[PDB]
Design a protein that fits this description.
Blueprint: E1 28-29, E2 36-37, E3 42-45, E4 55-56, E5 61-66, E6 81-83
Antiparallel strand pairs: 1-3, 2-5, 3-4, 5-6
Length: about 80
């Protein structure tokens, strides 16, 4: 069925997601995965160094799965939201 071989060296970035720069402090998410979005729709909110806040979607589309989580700080480098 499945196998376990530890997962050290990388994360789970798929294809299309957007990895953060280094880290930050989430504040509140808007989309709940599997939800369509438009260009400008604040997908969620963050706060690391005055360079995130309400993150508006880059273009119209639908989310395949959300990676980031609410109340999650210092978590950059991995894709935050999957889109495509």
């Amino acid at each position: 069925m499945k196998l376990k071989v530890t997962v050290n060296g990388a994360g789970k970035a798929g294809e299309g997601e957007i990895p953060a720069p280094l880290a930050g402090t989430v504040s509140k998410i808007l989309v709940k995965e599997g939800d369509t979005v438009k260009a400008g729709q604040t997908v969620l909110v963050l706060e690391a160094m005055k360079m995130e806040t309400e993150i508006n979607a880059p273009t119209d589309g639908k989310v395949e799965k959300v990676l980031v989580k609410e109340r999650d700080a210092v978590q950059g480098g991995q894709g935050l939201i999957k889109i495509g």
